[PDB]
Design a protein around this ligand. Structure first.
Ligand SMILES: CCCCCCCCCCCCCCCCCC(=O)OC[C@H](COP(=O)([O-])OCC(O)COP(=O)([O-])OC[C@@H](COC(=O)CCCCCCCCCCCCCCCCC)OC(=O)CCCCCCCCCCCCCCCCC)OC(=O)CCCCCCCCCCCCCCCCC
Ligand SMILES: CCCCCCCCCCCCCCCCCC(=O)OC[C@H](COP(=O)([O-])OCC[N+](C)(C)C)OC(=O)CCCCCCCCCCCCCCCCC
Ligand SMILES: CCCCCCCCCCCCCCCCCC(=O)OC[C@H](COP(=O)(O)OCCN)OC(=O)CCCCCCCCCCCCCCCCC
Ligand SMILES: CCCCCCCCCCCCCCCCCC(=O)OC[C@H](COP(=O)(O)OCCN)OC(=O)CCCCCCCCCCCCCCCCC
Ligand SMILES: NC(=O)C1=CN([C@@H]2O[C@H](COP(=O)(O)OP(=O)(O)OC[C@H]3O[C@@H](n4cnc5c(N)ncnc54)[C@H](OP(=O)(O)O)[C@@H]3O)[C@@H](O)[C@H]2O)C=CC1
Ligand code: SF4
Ligand code: SF4
Ligand code: SF4
Ligand SMILES: [Zn+2]
Lengths: 155, 341, 94, 95, 114, 207, 112, 176
């Protein structure tokens, strides 16, 4: 049966991608400090297979951890475009989510989703390190639900 | 007008354009520009999609919060069509495929599916209906793609008499399968052209021109019940167009004539791919079909769109096809192709 | 706390410290997560008499700046020269 | 309580409901309309009126400093009950 | 009416600074198009430069002209050193903004803005 | 010593007043006003022509030695014909003292760059130019520092709107970030907070 | 002799007494060209002469440093060089002259 | 008082000089640093097993918002708009009118959770303990629109979390 095979192959690639999520070493403001605390020993994001890598060419996730200003917006879009696919964006904190405390500023982008597509929105100012980890595990369960091969089979 | 659809604002992202549009086939080449233009002015857009939600992510930034709504649908299921259209004021059909698959053939995507969308839209009270046909649609065509475009075009008009039907020539743009198609031939050495491209004339049209024409059709009360032909401003011999493509890309051009029957055999070879075929017999036919001249139909000028010359936009498409040595060459470094007068 | 004796010895030797006296993981020396209710004190203005607000109103004692010179004898410095610091007697040199 | 319009859309405790022909109800298609089922106007009406022996009664909402500011309610009218303006509890003076 | 100058003592001196700035912008456009890999032509870039100078043709205050030139030099420096990105260069061309017709009727149909 | 009231330090007020007129005596060509607040901060208000002479004197004079420029900022007061007040906050480590020097300028009048006196002033003046549009003459490298490239206007002016005039988004058609006129899904809600009853009689202005 | 002043880049001076005498004497000479009634001259001569008195009457560096209250003797030398530089600059500025211009009517009024 | 962090003179007796030569050639102080990381290898790690284990919190924790009720079930909020006035982010939007029974109640109460800075000023300002920040911090969403809370969402949060919220308020209200 073709369906059974592509169903199992979807599980394999979905498992491999969520089990090995490499965020780009990309932080913007206060929220990056809680992101640092997710890598710290108490939460040890490495133990889920989550490893920071500096190069966008070697990153699977962009965690927008902090305010995105207008001056920074073209750079964030640049490094997002330079990530190979599949790629995911996690929006962390009120600033990234929708402008937050600086929503009405002349120099702030009112939400990073004006610039890049966003898979998960982590609320808080900042979200606790555990709240960000909950957001990453939520991203994993989203990847687990993907049906690329199943949809390809029925094209 | 219901009070929720009275236009407000200054026509920006956070405005209210009053358009509530269901766009079928929004996840393709043409759809991304149509959804972008609707979202620019604060329209409500319903994007029914068959694909993986990952492949709709590029659409999400195009609208203010709540202005892009995604739905699952199946071209064979009429309920899924009804749910996606019963709140809309205009329905736009951009469903199409350049190859047949095991599950959907040209008849399914260019006749059965477009007819079902039109039928359900009429039953649901949808007021406007825009359907994309093809300039060269002809029942007497060697291309099954173009034969189905002719059958479905008649069906849509009969099912939804007030529909606006748009017939574009080949569309060129960043994500096209036209200029990118010719540029990608370089991977096989020389460029095979039937009769050396001297017996074909094309009149390609810019993607943004088609998009602006679609958007003005929605807002134009005179466009209801009409059939338009969206053509670019100049006609070229196929050989000249392909030579120009390779000049803009600064790639070596080796054209050699290939007979029609040999090209078809090559087309059948690439069709064996279970993915997106690089080329097909039908694709070879359409590329070598002369673009019809239809003076009796209204065109882009009748919707307030001035057609963009191919010379102003080819580099926007073809710069990525150059090597490092030639990446920075400017728009004025290549002379235009001979345009048929 | 659950390390075996030999492992405690090994890491004590490797670091050169007695690591068991100051473990960085918290056990039972920390406070209970449920506490008795507090009974917080009140401030000096919680009185029933001799407490008129006009006698304890800091904002209404703020005054506009004193104009020293406007355009409408020994030299001085802004303050006395700063006294020289003394070396620590706890540990003068690190 | 929570009623449904003729379209089937639940009516909220604020009386909100999209009318037929309002496109905005498309946002609920494939999802749901979040409606709180415990209507406070119905719940408070269920409380019994409290009988008291004085012309004026005070209400703090209960729980001491966990309620609302303490207010005093006049009970001189027998044509109606005194209602706390913070919590809606009703009081009556008996004979 | 006696004020401290910025650079130019009079409009005659100011207009000299303007011309030198115009030359610098005119010379730079071919470099900007090539370096930034813009899809506009050198003629479009130079027409835009002319459009920006034309909008301030009515100034008769030497201090205002001096400040316009100072900002023009700053803008040119940002472009030459590629501190600006392609997005910043293309902002002068407002490519994504739809025309707003200026006739009374067209405004009347769309809203209350004069 | 009332527990909730800030105590008065009269010794500092006397010391700063004495030094206040000391500076006025030595630099009468420039000093226009000298004042000491009720929390013992000395302010010297000078004609803008004296920025370099006054700052040089305060840095170098043996009875001043204000070697550190703690801060250099501007304030916009639109009701004044010279709307911009330039404020230098200086620190003296030798005498453990602070002093504020204030001058003024308008939109079209340059102020002398004080980088030759304090190298710290380099970026502070760039910020003042960026946020207020005050031009500093003979600045080694005057350009925007905080605002976006090509940004138009000076945001810290009182008449520049809070949310500016343009905003950014990514446009898929041109495949780049674009700038467009600002529209807010929720307009900022202006609150009128001031009570209509006077609070501080000590500061009442004459009618 | 000091091995170090403790401040990075401030070299130890081998002959601080003579260096101070040179500098204060130079400062006094420069003040001679300032008008007699200029407050900068009167004040700077007064404080400059006090330091010159203390240098002459105190031969020990440490005891001299305590009297001067200016930090290290190398710090005091630097301050003398700074004062000399200021005195020369004051001659071109002439800040003893009357106020160049009154401010507008309400330039310093606060609150507006 | 002050101290010198780095102002010491090495001794020049032959033993000290050789001690330093052995340090330079035998890498003794680099070997010493290896000892420290070795000791950490055999220390129990500080990692907790999320999501089966949770980091410790206190009753004052400021998390997801919720609108509360009295024991009768009536809403505590009486539309005073103090929370809306104090909100540093202007995250709160309120409309109100007399209810059908005359009560002073809101018809709109929105919190934009992407504007909110989770500062807790709103619950300090509330005179009736109506708006609170609850203990939930695990409510990340897949879409932006899901974080624009209206009154129905906030009331559902209160009904969902009231058991924990009431106990947290009981533990801390004597510090307020
Ligand atoms: C190739 C190498 C691999 C092959 C060798 C396989 C050897 C068997 C290893 C079994 C370890 C399991 C220990 C155990 O029973 O779990 C206790 C544990 C319950 O104990 P606990 O209550 O948590 O407390 C732990 C101790 O109190 C707290 O822990 P602790 O730090 O006190 O350690 C206790 C014990 C644990 O150690 C062992 O038992 C195994 C020792 C193997 C040494 C090999 C090196 O070690 C000792 O008692 C001291 C002697 C151990 C040798 C130490 C010398 C270290 C090297 C010298 C330093 C310089 C290095 C440079 O039960 C489990 O959780 C079972 C988990 C299973 C773990 C995997 C075991 C299989 C490993 C792979 C097998 C081959 C594939
Ligand atoms: C140390 C070495 C380690 C090597 C590890 C090797 C990986 C082992 C696990 C393999 C899993 C199966 C592959 C699935 C991943 C495919 C990537 C993908 O997600 O595509 C989604 C795509 C989705 O396509 P789509 O049609 O649904 O939509 C994409 C188009 N748009 C953008 C318009 C939506 O799937 C496919 O296109 C085809 C899937 C076929 C799966 C079977 C793979 C056959 C392999 C032959 C390929 C031909 C080249 C020969 C390569 C060598 C053969 C081994
Ligand atoms: C006697 C004469 C006989 C002549 C025989 C040779 C005939 C050659 C037929 C030419 C067919 C044209 C094929 C065009 C093409 O190759 O492009 C399609 C495809 C690239 O994919 P694309 O369509 O651009 O878009 C999806 C990208 N994800 O494929 C590619 O371009 C990728 C190629 C990679 C390089 C390997 C070749
Ligand atoms: C009978 C007659 C016999 C005659 C023959 C006698 C010969 C023996 C006596 C000769 C001396 C023996 C020691 C020689 C070893 C090499 C010593 C050496 O090169 O160290 C010097 C080097 C520089 O140190 P530095 O202080 O920076 O600079 C010196 C001043 N310019 O310092 C360094 O190299 C620093 C290295 C930094 C990187 C270190 C990272 C790893 C450290 C841990 C490794 C532990 C060693 C484990 C070896 C495993 C071997 C399998
Ligand atoms: N040169 C051109 O591009 C020209 C195009 N046209 C017509 O314009 C329309 C769109 O053009 P283009 O956008 O380039 O075509 P694309 O192939 O780029 O996009 C096709 C769209 O149709 C959808 N679709 C295809 N097959 C099915 C199916 N079986 N069931 C459901 N959805 C389906 C695709 O969804 P998914 O992504 O899920 O496959 C995709 O969104 C087509 O009708 C085309 O014929 C007319 C003239 C010229
Ligand atoms: S969301 Fe809050 S914590 Fe995060 S960057 Fe913005 S202000 Fe800082
Ligand atoms: S927590 Fe602070 S920012 Fe959030 S709604 Fe309450 S007052 Fe506003
Ligand atoms: S402060 Fe409390 S009672 Fe007042 S409007 Fe806000 S939630 Fe309602
Ligand atoms: Zn009550």
């Amino acid at each position: 049966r073709g369906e059974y095979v592509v169903a199992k192959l979807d599980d394999l690639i979905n498992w491999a991608r969520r089990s090995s999520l490499w965020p780009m070493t990309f932080g913007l403001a206060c929220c990056a400090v809680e992101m640092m605390h997710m890598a710290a020993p108490r939460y040890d994001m490495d133990r889920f297979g989550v490893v920071f890598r500096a190069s966008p060419r070697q990153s699977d996730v962009m965690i927008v951890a902090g305010t995105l200003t207008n001056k920074m917006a073209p750079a964030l879009r640049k490094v997002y475009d330079q990530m190979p696919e599949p790629r995911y964006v996690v929006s962390m904190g009120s600033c990234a989510n929708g402008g937050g405390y600086y929503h009405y500023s002349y120099s702030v982008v009112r939400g990073c989703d004006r610039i890049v597509p966003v898979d998960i929105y982590v609320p808080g100012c900042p979200p606790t390190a555990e709240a960000l980890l909950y957001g990453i595990l939520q991203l994993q369960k989203k990847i687990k639900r993907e049906k690329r091969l199943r949809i390809w089979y029925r094209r | 007008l219901h009070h929720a659809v009275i236009p407000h604002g200054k026509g920006g992202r956070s405005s209210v354009s009053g358009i509530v549009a269901t766009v079928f086939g929004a996840t393709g080449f043409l759809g991304r520009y149509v959804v972008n233009h609707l979202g620019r002015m604060g329209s409500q857009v319903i994007v029914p999609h068959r694909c993986e939600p990952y492949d709709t992510m590029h659409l999400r930034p195009m609208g203010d919060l709540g202005q892009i709504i995604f739905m699952d649908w199946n071209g064979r299921d009429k309920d899924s069509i009804r749910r996606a259209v019963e709140h809309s004021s205009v329905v736009i059909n951009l469903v199409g495929r350049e190859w047949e698959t095991q599950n959907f053939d040209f008849e399914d995507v260019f006749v059965k599916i477009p007819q079902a969308i039109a039928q359900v839209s009429k039953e649901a009270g949808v007021e406007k209906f825009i359907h994309i046909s093809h300039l060269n649609a002809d029942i007497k065509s060697s291309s099954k793609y173009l034969r189905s475009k002719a059958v479905g075009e008649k069906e849509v008009r009969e099912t939804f008499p007030e529909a606006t039907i748009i017939k574009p020539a080949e569309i060129f743009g960043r994500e096209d399968r036209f200029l990118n198609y010719f540029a990608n031939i370089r991977w096989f050495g020389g460029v095979p052209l039937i009769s050396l491209g001297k017996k074909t004339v094309k009149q390609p049209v810019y993607i943004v021109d088609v998009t602006k024409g679609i958007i003005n059709a929605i807002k134009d009360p005179d466009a209801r019940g009409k059939t338009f032909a969206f053509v670019g401003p100049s006609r070229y011999l196929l050989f000249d167009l392909v030579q120009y493509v390779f000049a803009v890309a600064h790639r070596p051009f080796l054209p050699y004539p290939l007979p029609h029957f040999a090209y078809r055999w090559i087309g059948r070879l690439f069709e064996i791919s279970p993915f997106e075929p690089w080329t097909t017999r039908d694709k070879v036919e359409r590329i070598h079909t002369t673009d019809k001249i239809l003076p009796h139909l209204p065109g882009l000028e009748d919707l307030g769109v001035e057609a963009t010359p191919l010379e102003l936009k080819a580099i926007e498409v073809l710069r990525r096809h150059r090597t490092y040595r030639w990446l920075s060459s400017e728009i004025e470094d290549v002379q235009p192709a001979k345009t048929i007068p | 706390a659950s390390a075996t004796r030999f492992i405690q010895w090994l890491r004590n030797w490797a670091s050169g410290r007695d690591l068991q006296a100051k473990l960085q993981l918290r056990y039972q020396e920390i406070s209970k997560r449920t506490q008795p209710p507090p009974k917080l004190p009140v401030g000096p203005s919680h009185k029933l008499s001799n407490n008129y607000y006009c006698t304890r109103d800091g904002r209404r004692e703020a005054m506009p700046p004193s104009i020293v010179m406007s355009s409408q004898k020994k030299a001085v410095s802004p303050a006395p020269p700063i006294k020289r610091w003394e070396l620590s007697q706890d540990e003068p040199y690190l | 309580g929570v009623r449904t319009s003729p379209t089937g859309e639940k009516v909220t405790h604020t009386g909100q409901v999209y009318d037929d022909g309002d496109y905005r109800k498309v946002r609920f298609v494939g999802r749901q309309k979040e409606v709180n089922e415990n209507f406070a106007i119905d719940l408070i009406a269920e409380q019994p009126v409290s009988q008291v022996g004085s012309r004026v009664i005070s209400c703090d909402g209960g729980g001491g400093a966990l309620g609302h500011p303490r207010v005093y309610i006049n009970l001189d009218k027998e044509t109606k009950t005194g209602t706390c303006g913070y919590c809606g509890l009703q009081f009556r003076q008996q004979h | 009416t006696s004020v401290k100058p910025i650079f130019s003592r009079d409009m005659n001196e100011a207009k000299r600074r303007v011309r030198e700035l115009y030359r610098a912008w005119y010379r730079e456009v071919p470099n900007t198009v090539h370096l930034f890999q813009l899809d506009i032509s050198v003629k479009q870039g130079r027409d835009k430069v002319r459009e920006m100078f034309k909008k301030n043709a009515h100034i008769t205050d030497p201090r205002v002209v001096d400040l316009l030139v100072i900002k023009g030099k700053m803008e040119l420096e940002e472009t030459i050193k590629v501190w600006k990105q392609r997005t910043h260069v293309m902002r002068f061309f407002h490519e994504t903004e739809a025309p707003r017709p200026k006739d009374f009727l067209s405004k009347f149909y769309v809203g209350h803005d004069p | 010593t009332r527990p909730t009231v800030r105590p008065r330090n009269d010794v500092a007020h006397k010391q700063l007043s004495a030094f206040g007129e000391y500076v006025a005596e030595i630099l009468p060509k420039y000093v226009q006003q000298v004042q000491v607040s009720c929390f013992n901060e000395l302010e010297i208000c000078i004609h803008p022509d004296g920025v370099i002479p006054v700052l040089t004197f305060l840095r170098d004079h043996s009875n001043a030695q204000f070697k550190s420029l703690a801060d250099l900022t501007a304030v916009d007061i639109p009701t004044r014909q010279n709307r911009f007040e330039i404020v230098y906050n200086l620190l003296s480590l030798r005498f453990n003292s602070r002093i504020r020097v204030k001058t003024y300028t308008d939109e079209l009048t340059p102020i002398e760059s004080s980088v030759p006196v304090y190298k710290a002033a380099n970026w502070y003046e760039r910020e003042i130019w960026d946020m207020f549009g005050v031009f500093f003459a003979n600045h080694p490298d005057l350009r925007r520092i905080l605002t976006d490239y090509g940004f138009e206007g000076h945001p810290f002016r009182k008449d520049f709107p809070l949310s500016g005039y343009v905003e950014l988004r990514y446009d898929d058609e041109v495949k780049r970030v674009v700038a467009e006129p600002v529209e807010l899904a929720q307009e900022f809600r202006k609150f009128d907070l001031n009570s209509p009853w006077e609070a501080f009689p000590a500061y009442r202005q004459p009618p | 002799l000091k091995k170090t002043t403790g401040l990075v880049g401030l070299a130890v001076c081998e002959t601080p007494h003579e260096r101070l005498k040179i500098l204060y004497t130079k400062i006094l000479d420069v003040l001679g060209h300032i008008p007699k009634n200029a407050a900068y001259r009167k004040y700077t001569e007064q404080i400059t002469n006090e330091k010159l008195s203390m240098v002459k009457a105190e031969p020990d560096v440490k005891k001299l440093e305590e009297r001067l209250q200016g930090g290290q003797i190398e710090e005091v030398i630097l301050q003398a060089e700074n004062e000399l530089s200021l005195a020369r600059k004051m001659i071109q500025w002439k800040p003893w002259e009357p106020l160049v211009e009154e401010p507008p009517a309400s330039q310093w009024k606060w609150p507006i | 008082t002050y101290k010198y962090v780095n102002l010491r003179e090495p001794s020049m007796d032959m033993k000290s000089v050789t001690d330093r030569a052995a340090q330079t050639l035998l890498w003794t102080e680099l070997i010493r640093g290896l000892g420290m990381t070795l000791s950490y290898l055999f220390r129990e790690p500080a990692t907790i097993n999320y999501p089966f284990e949770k980091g410790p919190l206190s009753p004052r924790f400021r998390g997801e918002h919720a609108l509360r009720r009295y024991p009768s079930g009536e809403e505590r909020c009486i539309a005073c708009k103090l929370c809306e006035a104090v909100c540093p982010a202007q995250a709160i939007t309120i409309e109100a009118e007399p209810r059908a029974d005359g009560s002073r109640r809101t018809t709109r109460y929105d919190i934009d959770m992407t504007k909110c800075i989770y500062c807790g000023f709103c619950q300090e300002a509330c005179p009736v303990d109506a708006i609170v920040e609850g203990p939930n911090f695990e409510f990340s969403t897949e879409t932006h629109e899901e974080l624009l809370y209206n009154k129905e969402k906030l009331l559902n949060n209160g009904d969902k979390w009231e058991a924990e919220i009431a106990a947290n308020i009981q533990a801390d209200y004597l510090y307020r």
